[PDB]
Amino acid sequence: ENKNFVISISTAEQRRNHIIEQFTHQNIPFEFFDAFTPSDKLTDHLQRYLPNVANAAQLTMGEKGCLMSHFMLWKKCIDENLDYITLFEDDILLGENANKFLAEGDWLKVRFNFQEIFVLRLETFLMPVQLEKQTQIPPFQQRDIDILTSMDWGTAGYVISQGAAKYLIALFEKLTTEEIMPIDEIMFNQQINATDYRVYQLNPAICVQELVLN
Amino acid sequence: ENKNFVISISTAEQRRNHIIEQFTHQNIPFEFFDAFTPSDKLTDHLQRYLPNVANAAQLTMGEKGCLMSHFMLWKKCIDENLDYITLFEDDILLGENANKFLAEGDWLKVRFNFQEIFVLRLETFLMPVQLEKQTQIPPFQQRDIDILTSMDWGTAGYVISQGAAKYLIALFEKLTTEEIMPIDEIMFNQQINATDYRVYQLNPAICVQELVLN
Numbered sequence: 184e185n186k187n188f189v190i191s192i193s194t195a196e197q198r199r200n201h202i203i204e205q206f207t208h209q210n211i212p213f214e215f216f217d218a219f220t221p222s223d224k225l226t227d228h229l230q231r232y233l234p235n236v237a238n239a240a241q242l243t244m245g246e247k248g249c250l251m252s253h254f255m256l257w258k259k260c261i262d263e264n265l266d267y268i269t270l271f272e273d274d275i276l277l278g279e280n281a282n283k284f285l286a287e288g289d290w291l292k293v294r295f296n297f298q299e300i301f302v303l304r305l306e307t308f309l310m311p312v313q314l315e316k317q318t319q320i321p322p323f324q325q326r327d328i329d330i331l332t333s334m335d336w337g338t339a340g341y342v343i344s345q346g347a348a349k350y351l352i353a354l355f356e357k358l359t360t361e362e363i364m365p366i367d368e369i370m371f372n373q374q375i376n377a378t379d380y381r382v383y384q385l386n387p388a389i390c391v392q393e394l395v396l397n
Numbered sequence: 398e399n400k401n402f403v404i405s406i407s408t409a410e411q412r413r414n415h416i417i418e419q420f421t422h423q424n425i426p427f428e429f430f431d432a433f434t435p436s437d438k439l440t441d442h443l444q445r446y447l448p449n450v451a452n453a454a455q456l457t458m459g460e461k462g463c464l465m466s467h468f469m470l471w472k473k474c475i476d477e478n479l480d481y482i483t484l485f486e487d488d489i490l491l492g493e494n495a496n497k498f499l500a501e502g503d504w505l506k507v508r509f510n511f512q513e514i515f516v517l518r519l520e521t522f523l524m525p526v527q528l529e530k531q532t533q534i535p536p537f538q539q540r541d542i543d544i545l546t547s548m549d550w551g552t553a554g555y556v557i558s559q560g561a562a563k564y565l566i567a568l569f570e571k572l573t574t575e576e577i578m579p580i581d582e583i584m585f586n587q588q589i590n591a592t593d594y595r596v597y598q599l600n601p602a603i604c605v606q607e608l609v610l611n
């Protein structure tokens with residue numbers, strides 16, 4: 184049964200087409216998961232499932248939609264008692280031999296105990312940064328002077344174990360409004376020194392966000 | 398009028414020799430700044446200048462020393478009324494024509510007024526997150542499964558304006574004990590556009606940390 188889910192706004196035609204292209208090109212099955220967007224449904228879900236996050240001003244409603252989308256997929260993994268689920272965001276580009284990693288789960292099943300608490304990142308692992316070209320301050324000795332900003336780290340491609348899905352659901356439900364942070368910080372950065380929770384990284388990575396590739 | 402300071406533990410003979418080699422090779426003047434290490438001197442400086450950081454258990458005393466070292470150099474920029482100061486950490490490797498940037502300052506003077514609030518990063522901006530090898534779970538299709546151990550950003554090579562030295566001193570003094578993080582993490586989080594503080598990036602970069610080179 185299919186374990187690959189791609190989080191995507193139902194109306195995002197171009198992204199969905201780019202996702203269909205790449206997955207079918209390598210014969211990798213997947214299903215779209217309709218992303219939560221600023222809407223009655225998202226407001227309602229925040230209220231019932233994560234009231235703490237509803238009251239948090241530090242995240243935009245779009246960031247809250249993305250968070251809700253990952254959260255409800257973790258909940259699907261638990262409710263359906265899946266060993267793991269593999270989640271993507273809809274701007275990913277698949278690397279060369281991605282079919283070997285994503286089309287079948289045997290390689291995971293022989294490696295991991297899925298009751299253990301872990302996430303395996305599939306995407307690139309550079310520190311999350313973006314450059315903005317600017318024209319007003321001229322280059323020197325053939326080097327540009329760009330404007331550097333930080334952004335949130337990627338949650339665009341990962342395998343999550345049933346163990347970690349339970350752990351992250353419990354954690355998100357327990358966080359106070361004040362403790363709410365971007366999904367990547369809670370999932371990755373804030374767990375780096377946790378007892379049971381491991382973050383693994385496929386190295387080299389097998390997928391990359393389109394923006395990150397630039 | 399020397400602008401270049403290299404943060405280095407006084408006893409780190411090999412790093413200092415590698416720094417002398419590269420800087421003298423390109424005729425770039427510089428001074429070592431004796432890095433603060435776990436010691437009475439560091440404890441004293443933390444107490445006088447950053448009591449908030451003294452009380453932070455989330456950081457090792459070495460991380461506190463590194464932070465104090467950058468902080469006191471920012472303070473020297475202001476106290477000595479330098480236009481800017483250029484800071485390095487002692488594992489840096491200089492690229493080809495670094496002398497054009499580091500031995501002369503007119504290029505900076507014609508681009509900026511030094512009471513503008515900016516940092517210009519000189520080191521690489523593509524920086525992998527820190528991964529740790531593990532042996533208990535075998536690789537698949539020539540990809541390793543590594544463990545995420547930290548997300549550190551480089552503070553090994555940058556120009557800071559007197560404007561930004563004042564801004565960063567004020568910011569560091571204002572952080573609560575709870576908000577204290579390693580210097581690179583704080584500075585990483587300051588790279589945003591909703592500020593008067595700008596971070597520029599030299600592209601391509603002119604230096605790299607030797608460990609990063611892999």
Ligand SMILES: O=c1ccn([C@@H]2O[C@H](COP(=O)(O)OP(=O)(O)O[C@H]3O[C@H](CO)[C@H](O)[C@H](O)[C@H]3O)[C@@H](O)[C@H]2O)c(=O)[nH]1
Pocket residue numbers: 190191192218219220221244245246248249250252271272273274334335336337338339365366367392
């Ligand atoms: O209202 C929305 C808007 C977007 N998304 C979804 O969010 C995902 C990522 O979209 P983008 O690539 O446009 O956004 P980013 O890659 O910039 O988001 C990145 O940074 C975010 C914070 O700004 C998150 O923390 C996240 O880890 C990370 O992938 C997509 O699947 C998209 O469908 C929603 O679920 N709801």
Ligand SMILES: O=c1ccn([C@@H]2O[C@H](COP(=O)(O)OP(=O)(O)O[C@H]3O[C@H](CO)[C@H](O)[C@H](O)[C@H]3O)[C@@H](O)[C@H]2O)c(=O)[nH]1
Pocket residue numbers: 404405406432433434435458459460462463464466485486487488549550551552553579580581582
């Ligand atoms: O007690 C100490 C130890 C080190 N340093 C200074 O810290 C700088 C960086 O030292 P290393 O490269 O040995 O430390 P890391 O290998 O940890 O360096 C990188 O990794 C760190 C992650 O913990 C930080 O992000 C740091 O800024 C980053 O450049 C050097 O100038 C060193 O002199 C001190 O001031 N005091």
Ligand SMILES: [Mg+2]
Pocket residue numbers: 272274339392394
């Ligand atoms: Mg993205």
Ligand SMILES: [Mg+2]
Pocket residue numbers: 486488553606608
């Ligand atoms: Mg270093």
